[PDB]
Design a protein around this ligand. Structure first.
Ligand SMILES: O[C@@H]1[C@@H](O)[C@H](O[C@@H]2CO[C@@H](O[C@@H]3CO[C@@H](O[C@@H]4CO[C@@H](O)[C@H](O)[C@H]4O)[C@H](O)[C@H]3O)[C@H](O)[C@H]2O)OC[C@H]1O
Length: 396
């Protein structure tokens, strides 16, 4: 049928999963005859399922979460994502002014944003006091020192979901962004040129952290967002003192604490400055979640994504996901102190880089994440991380 639309998101459980049920329901009420069939897919499975399904756009989902950056671009150039420039509502155009750029390719708009999620450090303020850290580290070396203190207090300083590859890679990404100059960074990413010394230097800085042995012991088998022993789970239950992550973090943590209530002592702090690096200080990096429409889809799918962008639904999104909504007016309803700081950093950044693996695409992103994990497991070098990107870059 025609007024029936398949819809894929990655809110696996909890309020987030329920939020989408609720949205579908009240969408169905406002557009009679329409039925929304939902698939809630866990994040690490999502790319695979989306790309298998979209080989046949006719038999794929009508509305789906985007993979972001070059990965969205890869779908556009395959004709798996419909052009929404002349279709997004005026409410979206007005309210998602700053966030729509993440969804814009070749001047054309390809999705509706629901959230913006910068990265940084999320930490236990309680575990920090117990170890003797009264102030958050403004530099990398201070951070590595704070990890030593935290280890001595007999807690795992850093939770790391290395089994999922990307969470470990985020350390690398952040180091490269601080080490490389904005122009070398911007050119490297866009040209797939990884020859500059800032790319090896960053890995060296990451190997330093590795040598400190300050991760949770099972980091190699630790996932990011699955279970109590996932890296968010370790942070949520005060088994580790900090994690490097996107601003989806409070909502994730909230679903992994004993009472499924927000992490009482949660704090945020920007990824520190790095001595000798030439990156624009306080450079932001992060994500923008948005929803794409199947090129082979009907008007009902268009009205659905526009529905997402309406202020009330975005405010509800913010509460359900404990995140920053895309809609600037809906950001009013944000109360979490850590998320407040993140908005402060957001409202004064000159730019935000997308996640590096997202920016570089599937081949280069995957080869990069694996390589970083390999070095961390003592089967790779900072030089090998570079090698790997270069080798995969050959394919395009
Ligand atoms: O390649 C890397 C990416 O994969 C990565 O993807 C992001 C990772 O995490 C995703 O966050 C989602 C968001 O919501 C969670 O569910 C809700 C959380 O809050 C609760 O209130 C609620 O009840 C839940 O439904 C979810 O579990 C989690 O997976 C995110 O959307 C992705 O964009 O980013 C970086 C790349 O390097």
């Amino acid at each position: 049928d025609d007024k029936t639309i398949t819809f894929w998101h990655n809110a696996s459980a909890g309020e987030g999963r329920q939020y989408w049920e609720n949205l579908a329901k009240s969408f169905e009420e406002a557009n009679p005859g329409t039925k929304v069939e939902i698939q809630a897919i866990q994040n690490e499975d999502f790319a695979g399922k989306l790309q298998t399904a979209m080989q046949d756009p006719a038999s794929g989902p009508d509305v789906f979460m985007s993979l972001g950056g070059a990965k969205t671009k890869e779908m556009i150039d395959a004709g798996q994502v419909m052009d929404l420039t002349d279709k997004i509502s005026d409410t979206v155009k007005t309210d998602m002014k700053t966030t729509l750029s993440a969804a814009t390719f070749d001047g054309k708009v390809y999705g509706v944003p629901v959230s913006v999620e910068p990265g940084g450090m999320w930490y236990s303020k309680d575990l920090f006091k117990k170890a003797g850290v009264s102030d958050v580290p403004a530099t990398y070396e201070e951070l590595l020192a704070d990890a030593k203190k935290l280890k001595d207090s007999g807690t795992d300083a850093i939770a790391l979901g290395a089994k999922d590859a990307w969470p470990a890679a985020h350390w690398y990404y952040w180091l490269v962004l601080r080490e490389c100059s904005p122009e070398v960074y911007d050119k490297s990413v866009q040209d797939h040129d990884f020859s500059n010394a800032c790319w090896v230097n960053a890995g060296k800085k990451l190997q330093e952290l590795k040598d400190l042995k300050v991760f949770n012991d099972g980091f190699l088998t630790t996932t990011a967002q699955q279970g109590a022993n996932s890296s968010a789970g370790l942070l949520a239950n005060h088994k580790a003192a900090m994690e490097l992550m996107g601003a989806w973090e409070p909502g994730v943590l909230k679903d992994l604490t004993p009472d499924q209530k927000p992490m009482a002592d949660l704090g945020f702090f920007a990824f520190p400055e790095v001595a000798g690096g030439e990156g624009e200080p306080g450079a932001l990096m992060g994500g923008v979640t948005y929803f794409c429409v199947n090129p082979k889809a009907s008007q009902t799918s268009i009205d659905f994504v526009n529905y997402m962008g309406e202020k009330k639904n975005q405010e509800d999104y913010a509460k359900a996901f404990s995140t920053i909504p895309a809609s600037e007016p809906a950001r009013a309803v944000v109360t979490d102190e850590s998320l407040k700081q993140v908005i402060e950093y957001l409202d004064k950044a000159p730019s935000m880089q997308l996640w590096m693996d997202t920016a570089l695409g599937t081949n280069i992103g995957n080869a990069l994440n694996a390589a970083v994990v390999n070095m961390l497991s003592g089967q790779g070098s900072p030089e090998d991380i570079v090698k790997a990107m270069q080798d995969a870059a050959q394919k395009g």
